[PDB]
Point group: D2
Chain length 216, copies 4
């Protein structure tokens, strides 16, 4: 139902401090090897007056390597698909809510995402564009009410050193009953590998591998 090589399209719209924007992306990768790559274009509201980094993790949870002994909640949701709902709380008080809807047509995945972010302070690092990508991260995942819940302590690298913290809570909602995983983790690295001067165009590479708890 999901082939070992897949493509995908991303339509993302939203607001940041009330500034509207649209993004489109084309991506590809190996759903079973955990790798993927995507090229995004700001099609409306560019150049963005805020850091691109807040949008990069919104742009492919089907592309996560599960070992055969951990039920892969999101792959099983197919072909009906799944949604996800996400809250990001930044340490200087900014909050975003983001939702995704994922569908499949052949060997193309389609993600529709809505992004709403606000209370980024005018002198903070998102609005001054002082961020330099995300540390690699590790999401704690567990099953509840037939849903998959993910908690991630994320951090943006800052220009001139140190970190700007963001907590992620992501709820994954299959459109049909599936076989629920036990308690586990997903390790990710997200990199911007190319971009133009004003981030109206961007390319990213992500690796994500699920695993059992490392110790015991």
């Amino acid at each position: 139902v999901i082939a070992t090589q897949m493509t995908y399209k991303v339509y993302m719209s939203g607001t940041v401090n009330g500034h509207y924007f649209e993004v489109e992306g084309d991506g590809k990768g190996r759903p079973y090897e955990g790798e993927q790559t995507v090229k995004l274009t700001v099609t409306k509201g560019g150049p963005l007056p805020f850091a691109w980094d807040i949008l990069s993790p919104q742009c492919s949870i089907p592309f996560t390597k599960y070992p055969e002994d951990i039920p892969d909640y999101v792959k099983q949701s197919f072909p009906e698909g799944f949604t996800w709902e996400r809250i990001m709380n930044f340490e200087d008080g900014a909050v975003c809510t983001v939702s995704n809807d994922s569908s499949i047509q052949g060997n193309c995945f389609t993600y529709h995402v809505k992004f709403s972010g606000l209370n980024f302070p005018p002198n903070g690092p998102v609005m001054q564009k002082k961020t330099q990508g995300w540390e690699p991260s590790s999401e704690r995942l567990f099953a509840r009410g037939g849903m998959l819940i993910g908690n991630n302590f994320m951090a943006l690298k800052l220009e001139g050193g140190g970190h700007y913290l963001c907590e992620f809570k992501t709820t994954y909602k299959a459109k049909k009953p599936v076989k629920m995983p036990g308690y586990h983790y997903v390790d990710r690295k997200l990199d911007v590998t190319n971009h133009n001067k004003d981030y109206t165009s961007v390319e990213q590479c992500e690796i994500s591998i699920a695993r059992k708890p490392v110790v015991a």
Copy 2:
């Protein structure tokens, strides 16, 4: 610049658990007496599969009675106007982010609002439609960085008694420097005074009066 009787139009769109909707409203009242009334129509995505109450407070901060001894931040923002950015955190984990943009053309105010709400649990009171309006509330307001910040502990009455708590944080952003108020409160009552069977149409009445701290 603001007459003692004013009308207004509301265009509100957004998502709740990823369900898209549009609302339009026509309202009127006495900006200096703190009273106002509005009739709303769900123009898209109706009937809504969630409680209307989560949307009612999104639908007119110009209509707040200030005593002459408290600078009225929002009226002064006119005619350039103002925006506001709002986070609502519900005690069962749901969060919404909402932004408004307010403009003026003659004696009509126009509010454009975007609403993004999610992680309302499927058996909770918003999705089961068990709520029965908001308690009257009192918002703590103070000045910082040229902005007005409002904190409100809100509560929805529940069918069969008790309360469902929601915290509001609202940041009001004038589009030009204005004269900043000191520390103060705004008391509100919001009532649904008419509606049809499925809340595709709704009418509301609100009173809001600013005051100094009651004791000392």
Copy 3:
């Protein structure tokens, strides 16, 4: 059971960033008029290396004026008494947990309080002693599981202007079933009216009056 003039004793111990301290106080006032006054001494761990203001609201909920039409949960708890449990979350990340136990012997109230506060940053206003008393405040109060729950958005005035925000959540637990109040507010002003140079001795005056919602 509670006379119209009452005295009280306060024994408070705790830690702030791990620094242990003990306070004792002697207080008096009119439980039915909402007024009271208390003199506190730092009996151990003085002079304190942090702002006294974080301790001032820990030092008499029996002394709150209720109108006859609002059940007074805390007075009814007597003579068995009551406890309260409190969480304070400061906007720069510091948190305290505080519990009180209140007993009565004749016309003396006795409050035993434990205070635990930490993650006050070393350059923040509590540890640099930059605070200048609390704004007057207004606590939203409601009944649940036979308990009284109070939510308060508090603010400390800062040296050189502006505010340092603290959210209070206080749960009041009668030691026997009592008649539960409806949804209401309590307005307070707390003032330090005298002190010595290093706040090893302090005197405070508080007024608190319960009321119904002001508007509607």
Copy 4:
């Protein structure tokens, strides 16, 4: 300064919903291999009317295996030592604040800990004793202001399945400047390996290993 085999003593006192308790413990292990074991006795306030599990993670951060390429902030703090300050936020609203002070005398470590926990609801799993140990966990660690900050999404297993979530924030404060680590993780498993009927006596085994991010 720290030998490859070490012993330790724990004195812990505190309150839970205002119930006072004291614990003492004797422990031993291999500070460089990440292993350790400890036997605890409730010396005052036993039997405890709440789940022991809330106390088990308070009872040895010197015993963490660092690879040679990650500065070990806590070992370097010796012999002056270190403190830590911790906030635990449980998903049903309970909060604890905990502080530790660690000293060294020869080849014995001494931990003094204070524990303050409250708003555990009377029918929740801590007060009904429905918990069954902690999932293995993984703490995100980073340097800021000369301090080490740790964020952990923890979970208690429940009787009859599912999880009760607790977020940990722990700040580690060396008593002298040390060489600061980069961004890293510590994986732990904490097990109760023996206990008597009412948890007045308890034995625990913990493994903790620091590592770099797994992916990239």
